[PDB]
């Protein structure tokens, strides 16, 4: 059993930066992938960025690849989403997600993830 | 989507998931047991391990840690640090409540074995915090496996009751992030258990929710759980007859409608195989086994 | 019809098949080891168990029997009679040669555990005939599991050598119906072994040919062996890169062309690629 | 490993009877099916009769079902094929076969069997 708790959302002006964080607790020993998803109004949930939890590989969606960075804290079991050059189209609820079942690589399909956070609203105003 | 399956193997050839023991019977609980909260032998039908459950029987009901003569500070079985305040215990840590444990302790690089006697009731038994009493085990690093059990040292005069799990926490703090309880969802259903004979001074039968080989099968296959419950047949390999229908639920357990403890699943032979039939409603009405 | 597959699980999560121990490394044999004849951990690629190999780790490196104070009359683990002159030993019986065994003995219906010390060299060690010396174990029925090992009592001063199997027979009669020996195929290929740390007074590493979880997988799947050898990739789950190609042969063992397999990380997964000729030339690891 | 040794073949008159026997040795603990096959000149090996080794059920091919009986000796590890009302069409080499891999029922496919005897000639002359 794995618990995920996001924080750091809120209102930001266009062009600004915001760093989301997600605290991972419970059975983290065999968590293999941590990822961020986002769901905007009237749209389906979409993969944003993901990382091999104990590895070095990361993957970001093309729409954010040059602006968002996922990373793991060096001390605590916390994953970060650093969001730079934010745009109004980045407005969404952002969700932290964990994969514990064994897998090769960083999956992008939402139905492959095992645990989900409650989500945190990010609003980019122009 | 990868179709759901269970191993094509007879139950008599498989292992308990709460101790390294052959399966000897199918059982149901006494009537005062309506739910259980085992921490080992917990795997969803799409292969997600829960609680302290490992992939492999080589991790089941084992401990690893360093004694200083007063406490054993626990690690994971491979020596990896175990962090406190996170889960009930390290992966594979024994989950037999209602008994004293007798753990056979050995060492890499040294001769000999030592019997480690574990009363799981005192406030010094706090695996959630990474520490349990040494109870006389001298300083050193050990790996231990559960070898036999006996009645609990406390409460005085109580009986062995393997339907329980131990108290992983203490007066300091309750343990967190346990695997949740399981209960039978359907009409007239009871939980089904795979039983093993456990050594010790009584006729001990250890129940678990899934054979260990089912767990490594599910963890590998990871078949999407596309229905509410998996209808199963328990098939006799001699005749091919269906000996009874069962449901497996997504959280990783089986139920049946018994039609009796004296005539039901417990009298089924152990040489049969569980075979997936189809996905059915959570409230599919099972025919009584016996 | 049924395609050949191996478990979709990392090696470090699996178990040795000669003792209930986690896998800690991949190894190759020393040059003085020209063949191996392990009796446990023997399974064909279409799921046929060989030697004393069981389906489940709960039977591995265990004994069961009744002591009369002089011998232990062995049975199968569930109590079923084991008849002489048929096989090397009951299913799951330990197959670690080149060492003394120390087996933890417990009982159904009685308290306590007892360390049973087994020298496998004397003429009283005849599991092929269904009995081994009691060496002080009092009368009663026991179940035992291998707990730790030490150097063999005979010949005096010899070292632990887990590449061997014990002497199951006697001077009168050789044991029969053993799993056959396995030999290196040639072409610079070497056998691949899955290693586990074994407790006892040295840095003991126990080799086996297949993880136990592969065995229960093959025994269940029973995929027809439609080629001469199964080409495999050892895949890194972080990057997805192929760390090396291997061949699995129908008789149930892996090889590679080897800085080599012993330096490979143990967190990878073996993945079936395709059926190839037995003389298919592998790229060196 | 399981070893199988047949005996008892030979010449028989049409309408006569013959009993074949097969000695089973080695790892018999998990032999689950014993069967008899037969191979006529220029023909493939074909299922004749089979039994659950430790169970009670048997099955025979339709061409012999009312005339042939398979059984296991109560004292020794020997399987028998009792052949009655033999006809010239029964002439073949008969093989004993063992199956150890787990299976439900009695398979008839030659490819599913695990161990084979060396065969014994049966010739039915009129
Ligand atoms: C034999 C010991 O078993 C464990 O101690 C258990 C304890 O055993 C007692 C016996 O029941 C009694 O007949 C007499 O022999 O003393 C024994 C020691 O107290 O019984 C309690 C329940 O009352 C628990 O079951 C104990 O675990 C073990 O811890 C000891 O080291 C011995 O092996
Ligand atoms: C500790 C004992 O180990 C086994 O006996 C092994 C034997 O151990 C000897 C020690 O090596 C020696 O230092 C001294 O302590 O005596 C011990 C007993 O003889 O060593 C031989 C090889 O020389 C074998 O390896 C024995 O198996 C065990 O059988 C004993 O019960 C003790 O646990
Ligand atoms: Na406690
Ligand atoms: Na011998």
Residue numbers in the entry:
A (entry chain D), D (entry chain C): 1 to 126
B (entry chain A): 228 to 517
C (entry chain B): 228 to 485, 490 to 516
Provide the authors' own sentences about this structure as they appear in the paper.
Norovirus interaction with cofactor histo-blood group antigens (HBGAs) is important for infection (e.g., GI.1, GII.4, GII.10, and GII.17), although certain genotypes poorly bind HBGAs (e.g., GII.1).
However, compared to Nano-7, fewer direct hydrogen bonds were observed, and most (7 of 10) were contributed with P1 subdomain residues. Interestingly, Nano-62 was also orientated in a way that one site of the Nanobody clashed with the S domain and neighboring P domains. In contrast, Nano-7 or Nano-62 treatment did not affect the VLP diameter.
